[PDB]
Please model this.
Amino acid sequence: MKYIGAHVSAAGGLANAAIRAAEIDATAFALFTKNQRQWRAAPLTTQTIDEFKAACEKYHYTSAQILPHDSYLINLGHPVTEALEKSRDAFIDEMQRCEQLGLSLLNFHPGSHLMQISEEDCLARIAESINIALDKTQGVTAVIENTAGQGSNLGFKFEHLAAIIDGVEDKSRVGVCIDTCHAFAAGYDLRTPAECEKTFADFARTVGFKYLRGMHLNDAKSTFGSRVDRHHSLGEGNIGHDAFRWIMQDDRFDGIPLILETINPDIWAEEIAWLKAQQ
DNA sequence: GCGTCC
DNA sequence: CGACGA
DNA sequence: TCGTCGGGGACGC
Ligand SMILES: [Zn+2]
Ligand SMILES: [Zn+2]
Ligand SMILES: [Zn+2]
Model:
């Protein structure tokens, strides 16, 4: 079975995210456990935690269906030692809030060399940041998102994801989330079923589906190989609808959160139903 | 620099 | 993007 | 329901 949802708002409380997901009839959801544009946040209160867990129980969201996302400020491959340490600290905190919330997946972005260190070195830093985090927590898998390759951001080649995973000690708790907009922006074509085949055979060869732990289902406002990260609603961007029907019909994408991060939340319920109906 | 996006 | 502010 | 912060790294002016 497929779990199909959106990144919903956690304004006014994490439980609100589960409630908003149920309102759009999602069978999966993503959320930020704290604001993603700020370094600090108050510790989770027992009430926040219990309210969240109660909401997930009420609406039948198990941890296998929820894909929290970390902060935009964390750079796990930072070339500067103090900034790298702050990010590593922030990332452990994020993993710990997952532990507290009963969440078992944490989606994050690889990291960026800021043209101060080599790609090789940066990828190894990221792999080490992940080892550090897995060392201080239990039961939460580090899910690496592919990227569009904007600026000095790594993760735009599947080989990057493979190289980070090769550096992770406990491979039982690392995985990947593929974002279709980002893949398309990085040069992986999805505009026809045949191109989808090609792109996911490449993924299979380089990373392998055993590490696939989530998807972000985004059309692209940016163009093919542009290396620009700009989402669009399904069917309205440069990828088009065929890729999404193709993914819904392929059983390799079952049992993982499939998350819309499309740009018009007013149509997520309709995007979710359209995806469901493509199966 | 801006407004905007992720 | 979520908290907050009046 | 509106403007603001926040403050990392970008994009397209
Ligand atoms: Zn992301
Ligand atoms: Zn994404
Ligand atoms: Zn994106």
Q: What stands out?
A: Residues A 145, 179, 216, 261 surround zinc ion (ligand 2) (CB under 6 Å).
